[PDB]
Amino acid sequence: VSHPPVDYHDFPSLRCELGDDGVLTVVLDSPGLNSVGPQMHRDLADIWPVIDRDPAVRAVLVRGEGKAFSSGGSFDLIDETIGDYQGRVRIMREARDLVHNMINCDTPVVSAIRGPAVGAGLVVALLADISVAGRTAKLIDGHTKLGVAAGDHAAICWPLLVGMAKAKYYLLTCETLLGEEAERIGLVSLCVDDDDVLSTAAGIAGKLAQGAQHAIQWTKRSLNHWYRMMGPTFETSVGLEFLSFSGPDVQEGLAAHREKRAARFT
Amino acid sequence: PVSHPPVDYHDFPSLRCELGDDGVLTVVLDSPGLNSVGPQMHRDLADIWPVIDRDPAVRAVLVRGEGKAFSSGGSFDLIDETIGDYQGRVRIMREARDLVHNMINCDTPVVSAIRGPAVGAGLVVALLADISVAGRTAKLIDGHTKLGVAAGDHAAICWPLLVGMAKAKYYLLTCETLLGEEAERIGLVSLCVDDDDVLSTAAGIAGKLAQGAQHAIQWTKRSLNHWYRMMGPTFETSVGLEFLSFSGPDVQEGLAAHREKRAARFT
Amino acid sequence: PVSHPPVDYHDFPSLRCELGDDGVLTVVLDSPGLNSVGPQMHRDLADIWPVIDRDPAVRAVLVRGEGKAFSSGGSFDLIDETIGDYQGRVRIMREARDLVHNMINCDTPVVSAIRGPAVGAGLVVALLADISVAGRTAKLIDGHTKLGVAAGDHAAICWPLLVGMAKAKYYLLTCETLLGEEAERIGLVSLCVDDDDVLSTAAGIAGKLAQGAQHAIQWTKRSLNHWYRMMGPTFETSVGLEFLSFSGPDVQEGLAAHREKRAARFT
Amino acid sequence: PVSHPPVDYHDFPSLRCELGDDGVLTVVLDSPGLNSVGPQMHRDLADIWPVIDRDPAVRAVLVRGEGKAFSSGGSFDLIDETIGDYQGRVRIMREARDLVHNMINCDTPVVSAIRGPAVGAGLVVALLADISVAGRTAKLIDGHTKLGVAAGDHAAICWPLLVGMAKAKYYLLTCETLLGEEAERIGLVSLCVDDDDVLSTAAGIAGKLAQGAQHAIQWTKRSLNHWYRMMGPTFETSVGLEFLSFSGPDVQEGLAAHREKRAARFT
Amino acid sequence: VSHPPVDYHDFPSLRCELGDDGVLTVVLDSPGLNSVGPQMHRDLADIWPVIDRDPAVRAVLVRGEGKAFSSGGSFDLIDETIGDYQGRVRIMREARDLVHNMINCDTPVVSAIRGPAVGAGLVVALLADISVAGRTAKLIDGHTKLGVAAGDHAAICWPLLVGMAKAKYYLLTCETLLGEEAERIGLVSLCVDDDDVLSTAAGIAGKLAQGAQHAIQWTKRSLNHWYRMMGPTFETSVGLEFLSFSGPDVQEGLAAHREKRAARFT
Amino acid sequence: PVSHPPVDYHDFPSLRCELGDDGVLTVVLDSPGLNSVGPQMHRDLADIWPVIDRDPAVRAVLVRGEGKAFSSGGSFDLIDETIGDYQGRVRIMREARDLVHNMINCDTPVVSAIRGPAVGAGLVVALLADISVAGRTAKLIDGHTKLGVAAGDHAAICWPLLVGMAKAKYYLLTCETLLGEEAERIGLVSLCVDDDDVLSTAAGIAGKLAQGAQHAIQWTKRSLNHWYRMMGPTFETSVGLEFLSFSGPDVQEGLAAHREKRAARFT
């Protein structure tokens, strides 16, 4: 069966390096603590079906360049959502397809969370199969502090990671969750010293690419039915988030981020 | 102008309701016997939430018990009516069902301040709140199987999704006392602070929610609540099993053992 | 009267069954190779639960492994029949399905005493029991991906709802040894005690369960079990994937690596 | 005596409510433009059902439109407010969501008498009733995609479970007029009788329900409603998609085409 | 693997005949149009796990003796439910296990519905894989006319057979549904002339026992997940039914049946 | 701007794709043996839908079979690779899964023009389209149990929600031929027209869909598709069962009986 070839030239915002072991390193590298621009929002969403169709890739290691995973959506990305209907629908489709595609990717994914992981970056960090978080890594969903509903991933997984009591606490109040406490409540797989996050994650991803592929992938896919069965709930939250982008709270929350202040909502 | 009727809480006589300048509605359970839920307070707790959710003046809810106790659960008179009267049993059954379904279907944020014991119908309000603050020495006891009836007033809708099935099955089947400090570690409650700091911590949490982005907080809360809503039929199964067991002989012994300050000897 | 057939466990020769005065049925897994499950014990473990659930003399079940092991899982002859014979693979496949389904549909309370290693089909019984008591140093290993097959004997029905998805995927995909102390902390088991204290602790729990409110405990347990039942199709997906993978090349190497006490070189 | 507040329907000024000697509450939609749902009637239809369900005097509900039409759906002023104001769009969105969820969570039996057109918000009440009686020539039109917005006010919670996905997708995507006689054949409505017999047939059906076993009818109805309740998140997904599309350019054309007595030319 | 032997001496109220083709005929034969007594309520519930474990049985044909499938629960069965808690729990467990066991039986089942099928009999008639109903066969759930919630099967299947509008109509009002109309709305698989119901069903069951067994059974089991996923809803209705047996309506509805009159509920 | 890769369907050589001015992409299944699906067309049918859904020029999709047949299903060489090779069986198995999943997750409206027989993998495309137009005398046959394997290519995800469980089990277990006229009556297909009128009718529907409100039609379709998605695990269970049964003895006889144009004698 003839299948089309794979090259990642089509995802320009992401650096992708394939190793001898079969581990694909996907690096989020962009100004402002790896902030997700309009292009990287699409690239992150659409890359996963291509990786899963890649015969050379047996595992994926996702990380941010430098001392940060990703600081979330950029100001231009939030501006376009607020200002343009057709742009908002495009961005909304990408946010939906990011979660759906990571979940429907049978290939194992390991995340190396050092430093902040926010919004669209935290989606990739936590929906990875195995997540390695540093002790002082700041994990912030951040939506309600911005003034919109938390609809980019958390409604599909967080109760099944930490329990409803911890999920509601951090998602409604956006109190910062450090990496050491995140492992304790069950949000991430492992917590190591900050200097050991990438080495620990790299080692995990290496052994997965050298293991039994059908065993690892089919076990992962079966477990992913748990998230898949919460699809309608997630898409309910997605729609609620993008409805709220047309509201008055976000314009205050967006101005609050641009002025480095707390949002005073009314 | 779409005309909507005004709201006043005189229809809930067993509950003291205080609206603060911040928009937080404080709901206080105050009744004899460590805030025991009598027949009237069972209906009031069940039916107040749809009214609160439609209140333009209310932005957040802080639920607590008066003094050094949240609520000791249903009073002996409430249990006697369930056992003795079919029409009374059906009314209380609807109130137990609607308590859970109305708290979940209330988009307004709810914060609970659990100091002291939280039992049965009282533990329902304490744990179904969005953010729950428990004191270190707060006793959290579902208590149903020790009473002799099925645990069907809330635990089957949430406890597995709070602590995991292994801990859920352990505490619900054995009714071992779960203290507040241990409750937070396994994930049953949101926070654990010193007993003297429970009310101040919860009030501050409820304040910041009433001062936040209303639609953002409420729609995020509603989306998360679908996880409970999808376990609805499972929960209503536990409700019926509970009220079927109230006609059995075991509860008569468990209730008698409670009134007699002894352990229950079931046969 | 309604005539119901009498019950004696002679129909399950691989399992030792002891009925106590407390009402606890002790089910002992005892076989060569750290209580390895041969072809006969694979069926008995699957089919014993409907009969126990219909037993009037049984009020609770205590499962344990004989000696210093709970169970090492399916034996090499069981795996050999799985790889080589279609009718044998279908028979074993039906039993793996019915083991999980029948334990979940057993209303009788089940307590597991996990001292020593519990692997695969043995880990299914240990973790699907209602209350699980694990020793501090007890090795809990699903073991499928290290063997080279999909994890389809129980874990896809419960592990996410026991430890959360992040810990579930880590331990199930990598097969890192999970000790009992860490298993209790993350919520995979109900309790963790010293290894020498596992059996007395479990026996005490099963005793108090058999002397409690039967209908309350069994119906509370049954409602909680709807959480697993609703994931039935997910579990049966993993069952089919596991037995599809037994026909693959990976398991032949993983089996040979286990037989030579070395690490597997998968290609 | 558990004290519960009294019920009077003066809080629903757009709806005429008549309580008969049999216990049937007749709810009449009467408004200009073939009983078009204005801003006030949109809230009233949504919020009346929890009040009816708590009414001891009400044993059954008969919903109908005045004259030879059920309801033509939302008025042009209601659609203009949705498009033009965020706070107005949010209020109407909550009312659309709560209309569906309150009808389903109302245990009291509801019977609909569909003579003439039933459109949009009006078709919601007509089809979510327990037993629906449609005239032969009654036009049943969801109408959303022809208007230019997603079909998110009820059809995603029930239509597949009424007619099957192939017919559900056909009529909802194309908005072809579905007459009452054809609606009954595919299973969208309960009965089809002559147009002149719709009101007499429905009143008799509602009468026999109010004279039947109250808890039997209501608990049977509630159990069946879990089928809808379990599709809750799917329905709320359609609600949000509908109200997101109200900010798009297509609806402006569909609304303009409706006001101009022409076909919509979308680009 | 040694498995215990199978003989149906343990189900005394049911006549079971195994044919050369592999079809097991299970006949409901009892006084009063095959009324379900205390024993037959248990036998119907507990027989299915044994049939499914039977190597000799490849298909099942269920029918009533004479010109009736089954008239439902007997007066003594209803009396015991109303009067005794321990008896009510036993009967309730059987009603639950009847539905669950028929659904969890991989072996194909064909029902021959000629004449009335009520309550516990209609449960067996409609939960069969393929149902053959006569033109004039009366199909009546009958619970709300008796004064109890319809909790013996209908809440697990009826919406997925006829749609919610027809389900609510017949279950809430108990208007008689004849066999010809039942096929039209989709409640039964086939409708033939009354004299052809058993011959048509026998022929269907014969060909199923002579077909591909793993293909037929696994297709049936996968399709049965649809019912299995409505388990909690069904058990909600089961509990509601047996709670209502302690109410005042059933005592009137029971007296109404014993006096051959319509129940005047208050 | 956000740069997105260009789209041309040269990557799917077994499928003819024609783009019209109306915005309809016509996808034609054309191959020997009544449009039999060989190994290449099995992958193309699976993987084409994500690309179509991302195509800016495509507003609707019309699928049809060339000549007097929609599609006869998987070819004998495809079945031969399934029976004989593990890596080939896994590849074909992944494609069968992704065919259903990708059609359901394709927001673009799809209309099928079913003239003549549609069997197995071909029947998947015909019935999973949004609106299906079937000719009166078109033979619709799932065909799996007559072949000797489990029906795991689509029917377990939709047929109960298309025709009801009683008709679903009858046609899927016995493989009795279902003609288009009876298929429309029971709700398996959206429409039934004369055989010579199938293509013009489908083309007209797909045309009017491509000129309608895109976001309204696609989002209405996507919400309705959650009904199927929620049955995903059930569908994937049947997929695994089908490919487990391909290793059994029944299919070898059923395949030989088809090759000799005779009835299969299963043992």
PDB file of N, CA, C and O in Angstrom, chain D residues 116-149:
ATOM      1  N   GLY D 116     -51.009  22.603  13.281  1.00  0.00           N
ATOM      2  CA  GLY D 116     -50.409  23.700  12.562  1.00  0.00           C
ATOM      3  C   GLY D 116     -48.902  23.675  12.681  1.00  0.00           C
ATOM      4  O   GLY D 116     -48.298  22.643  12.986  1.00  0.00           O
ATOM      5  N   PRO D 117     -48.262  24.815  12.431  1.00  0.00           N
ATOM      6  CA  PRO D 117     -46.795  24.854  12.427  1.00  0.00           C
ATOM      7  C   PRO D 117     -46.210  24.736  13.827  1.00  0.00           C
ATOM      8  O   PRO D 117     -46.745  25.275  14.795  1.00  0.00           O
ATOM      9  N   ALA D 118     -45.085  24.036  13.921  1.00  0.00           N
ATOM     10  CA  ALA D 118     -44.279  23.989  15.137  1.00  0.00           C
ATOM     11  C   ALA D 118     -42.836  24.233  14.712  1.00  0.00           C
ATOM     12  O   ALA D 118     -42.243  23.401  14.019  1.00  0.00           O
ATOM     13  N   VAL D 119     -42.271  25.373  15.115  1.00  0.00           N
ATOM     14  CA  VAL D 119     -40.981  25.829  14.606  1.00  0.00           C
ATOM     15  C   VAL D 119     -40.056  26.182  15.761  1.00  0.00           C
ATOM     16  O   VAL D 119     -40.504  26.711  16.785  1.00  0.00           O
ATOM     17  N   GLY D 120     -38.761  25.897  15.587  1.00  0.00           N
ATOM     18  CA  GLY D 120     -37.726  26.330  16.510  1.00  0.00           C
ATOM     19  C   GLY D 120     -38.038  26.119  17.980  1.00  0.00           C
ATOM     20  O   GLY D 120     -38.221  24.985  18.436  1.00  0.00           O
ATOM     21  N   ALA D 121     -38.069  27.216  18.742  1.00  0.00           N
ATOM     22  CA  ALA D 121     -38.349  27.109  20.169  1.00  0.00           C
ATOM     23  C   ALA D 121     -39.710  26.474  20.427  1.00  0.00           C
ATOM     24  O   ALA D 121     -39.928  25.876  21.487  1.00  0.00           O
ATOM     25  N   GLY D 122     -40.639  26.606  19.480  1.00  0.00           N
ATOM     26  CA  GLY D 122     -41.939  25.974  19.638  1.00  0.00           C
ATOM     27  C   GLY D 122     -41.891  24.475  19.418  1.00  0.00           C
ATOM     28  O   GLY D 122     -42.573  23.715  20.113  1.00  0.00           O
ATOM     29  N   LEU D 123     -41.119  24.033  18.420  1.00  0.00           N
ATOM     30  CA  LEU D 123     -40.948  22.602  18.187  1.00  0.00           C
ATOM     31  C   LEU D 123     -40.256  21.922  19.370  1.00  0.00           C
ATOM     32  O   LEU D 123     -40.446  20.721  19.593  1.00  0.00           O
ATOM     33  N   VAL D 124     -39.456  22.670  20.136  1.00  0.00           N
ATOM     34  CA  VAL D 124     -38.814  22.106  21.321  1.00  0.00           C
ATOM     35  C   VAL D 124     -39.859  21.620  22.317  1.00  0.00           C
ATOM     36  O   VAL D 124     -39.807  20.481  22.795  1.00  0.00           O
ATOM     37  N   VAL D 125     -40.831  22.476  22.635  1.00  0.00           N
ATOM     38  CA  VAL D 125     -41.871  22.106  23.590  1.00  0.00           C
ATOM     39  C   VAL D 125     -42.736  20.991  23.019  1.00  0.00           C
ATOM     40  O   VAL D 125     -43.114  20.054  23.729  1.00  0.00           O
ATOM     41  N   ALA D 126     -43.024  21.051  21.717  1.00  0.00           N
ATOM     42  CA  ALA D 126     -43.908  20.074  21.089  1.00  0.00           C
ATOM     43  C   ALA D 126     -43.331  18.664  21.151  1.00  0.00           C
ATOM     44  O   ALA D 126     -44.058  17.704  21.435  1.00  0.00           O
ATOM     45  N   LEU D 127     -42.027  18.519  20.896  1.00  0.00           N
ATOM     46  CA  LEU D 127     -41.401  17.210  20.751  1.00  0.00           C
ATOM     47  C   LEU D 127     -40.823  16.669  22.052  1.00  0.00           C
ATOM     48  O   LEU D 127     -40.671  15.449  22.190  1.00  0.00           O
ATOM     49  N   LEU D 128     -40.479  17.539  22.999  1.00  0.00           N
ATOM     50  CA  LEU D 128     -39.979  17.091  24.293  1.00  0.00           C
ATOM     51  C   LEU D 128     -41.091  16.705  25.262  1.00  0.00           C
ATOM     52  O   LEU D 128     -40.794  16.170  26.336  1.00  0.00           O
ATOM     53  N   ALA D 129     -42.352  16.969  24.920  1.00  0.00           N
ATOM     54  CA  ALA D 129     -43.447  16.444  25.715  1.00  0.00           C
ATOM     55  C   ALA D 129     -43.405  14.920  25.697  1.00  0.00           C
ATOM     56  O   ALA D 129     -42.885  14.299  24.762  1.00  0.00           O
ATOM     57  N   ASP D 130     -43.973  14.315  26.746  1.00  0.00           N
ATOM     58  CA  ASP D 130     -43.934  12.862  26.877  1.00  0.00           C
ATOM     59  C   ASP D 130     -44.709  12.199  25.747  1.00  0.00           C
ATOM     60  O   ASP D 130     -44.198  11.307  25.060  1.00  0.00           O
ATOM     61  N   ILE D 131     -45.948  12.625  25.540  1.00  0.00           N
ATOM     62  CA  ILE D 131     -46.794  12.123  24.468  1.00  0.00           C
ATOM     63  C   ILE D 131     -47.140  13.319  23.595  1.00  0.00           C
ATOM     64  O   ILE D 131     -47.648  14.331  24.097  1.00  0.00           O
ATOM     65  N   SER D 132     -46.837  13.222  22.304  1.00  0.00           N
ATOM     66  CA  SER D 132     -47.073  14.315  21.372  1.00  0.00           C
ATOM     67  C   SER D 132     -48.131  13.903  20.356  1.00  0.00           C
ATOM     68  O   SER D 132     -48.008  12.853  19.710  1.00  0.00           O
ATOM     69  N   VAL D 133     -49.164  14.733  20.220  1.00  0.00           N
ATOM     70  CA  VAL D 133     -50.261  14.512  19.286  1.00  0.00           C
ATOM     71  C   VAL D 133     -50.169  15.559  18.182  1.00  0.00           C
ATOM     72  O   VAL D 133     -50.280  16.761  18.451  1.00  0.00           O
ATOM     73  N   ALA D 134     -49.953  15.109  16.945  1.00  0.00           N
ATOM     74  CA  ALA D 134     -49.794  15.998  15.798  1.00  0.00           C
ATOM     75  C   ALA D 134     -50.928  15.827  14.791  1.00  0.00           C
ATOM     76  O   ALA D 134     -51.341  14.702  14.488  1.00  0.00           O
ATOM     77  N   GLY D 135     -51.420  16.949  14.260  1.00  0.00           N
ATOM     78  CA  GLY D 135     -52.372  16.888  13.172  1.00  0.00           C
ATOM     79  C   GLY D 135     -51.723  16.440  11.875  1.00  0.00           C
ATOM     80  O   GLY D 135     -50.509  16.539  11.686  1.00  0.00           O
ATOM     81  N   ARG D 136     -52.557  15.923  10.965  1.00  0.00           N
ATOM     82  CA  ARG D 136     -52.040  15.377   9.711  1.00  0.00           C
ATOM     83  C   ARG D 136     -51.250  16.423   8.937  1.00  0.00           C
ATOM     84  O   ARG D 136     -50.167  16.132   8.413  1.00  0.00           O
ATOM     85  N   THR D 137     -51.760  17.655   8.880  1.00  0.00           N
ATOM     86  CA  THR D 137     -51.178  18.722   8.081  1.00  0.00           C
ATOM     87  C   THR D 137     -50.285  19.649   8.901  1.00  0.00           C
ATOM     88  O   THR D 137     -49.935  20.738   8.432  1.00  0.00           O
ATOM     89  N   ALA D 138     -49.893  19.228  10.103  1.00  0.00           N
ATOM     90  CA  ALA D 138     -49.042  20.050  10.952  1.00  0.00           C
ATOM     91  C   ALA D 138     -47.622  20.068  10.401  1.00  0.00           C
ATOM     92  O   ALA D 138     -47.019  19.012  10.184  1.00  0.00           O
ATOM     93  N   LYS D 139     -47.097  21.264  10.153  1.00  0.00           N
ATOM     94  CA  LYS D 139     -45.731  21.417   9.673  1.00  0.00           C
ATOM     95  C   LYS D 139     -44.785  21.404  10.868  1.00  0.00           C
ATOM     96  O   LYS D 139     -44.914  22.238  11.766  1.00  0.00           O
ATOM     97  N   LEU D 140     -43.855  20.447  10.899  1.00  0.00           N
ATOM     98  CA  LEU D 140     -42.845  20.354  11.957  1.00  0.00           C
ATOM     99  C   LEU D 140     -41.485  20.667  11.349  1.00  0.00           C
ATOM    100  O   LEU D 140     -40.943  19.863  10.579  1.00  0.00           O
ATOM    101  N   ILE D 141     -40.919  21.813  11.722  1.00  0.00           N
ATOM    102  CA  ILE D 141     -39.691  22.314  11.118  1.00  0.00           C
ATOM    103  C   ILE D 141     -38.757  22.787  12.220  1.00  0.00           C
ATOM    104  O   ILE D 141     -39.065  23.761  12.918  1.00  0.00           O
ATOM    105  N   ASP D 142     -37.601  22.129  12.349  1.00  0.00           N
ATOM    106  CA  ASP D 142     -36.554  22.664  13.217  1.00  0.00           C
ATOM    107  C   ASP D 142     -36.084  24.025  12.709  1.00  0.00           C
ATOM    108  O   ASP D 142     -36.043  25.003  13.465  1.00  0.00           O
ATOM    109  N   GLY D 143     -35.698  24.100  11.432  1.00  0.00           N
ATOM    110  CA  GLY D 143     -35.555  25.365  10.742  1.00  0.00           C
ATOM    111  C   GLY D 143     -34.241  26.092  10.926  1.00  0.00           C
ATOM    112  O   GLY D 143     -34.054  27.153  10.307  1.00  0.00           O
ATOM    113  N   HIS D 144     -33.315  25.550  11.725  1.00  0.00           N
ATOM    114  CA  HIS D 144     -32.123  26.306  12.101  1.00  0.00           C
ATOM    115  C   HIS D 144     -31.161  26.503  10.927  1.00  0.00           C
ATOM    116  O   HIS D 144     -30.733  27.630  10.653  1.00  0.00           O
ATOM    117  N   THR D 145     -30.807  25.430  10.213  1.00  0.00           N
ATOM    118  CA  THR D 145     -29.824  25.600   9.149  1.00  0.00           C
ATOM    119  C   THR D 145     -30.375  26.470   8.025  1.00  0.00           C
ATOM    120  O   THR D 145     -29.611  27.198   7.381  1.00  0.00           O
ATOM    121  N   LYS D 146     -31.691  26.436   7.793  1.00  0.00           N
ATOM    122  CA  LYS D 146     -32.283  27.353   6.822  1.00  0.00           C
ATOM    123  C   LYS D 146     -32.227  28.790   7.322  1.00  0.00           C
ATOM    124  O   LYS D 146     -32.175  29.727   6.514  1.00  0.00           O
ATOM    125  N   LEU D 147     -32.230  28.985   8.643  1.00  0.00           N
ATOM    126  CA  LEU D 147     -32.050  30.325   9.185  1.00  0.00           C
ATOM    127  C   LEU D 147     -30.594  30.771   9.103  1.00  0.00           C
ATOM    128  O   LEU D 147     -30.322  31.966   8.936  1.00  0.00           O
ATOM    129  N   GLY D 148     -29.661  29.832   9.162  1.00  0.00           N
ATOM    130  CA  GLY D 148     -28.248  30.121   9.128  1.00  0.00           C
ATOM    131  C   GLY D 148     -27.518  29.963  10.452  1.00  0.00           C
ATOM    132  O   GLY D 148     -26.447  30.568  10.619  1.00  0.00           O
ATOM    133  N   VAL D 149     -28.060  29.178  11.389  1.00  0.00           N
ATOM    134  CA  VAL D 149     -27.442  28.915  12.682  1.00  0.00           C
ATOM    135  C   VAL D 149     -27.550  27.421  12.949  1.00  0.00           C
ATOM    136  O   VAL D 149     -28.416  26.728  12.407  1.00  0.00           O
TER     137      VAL D 149
END
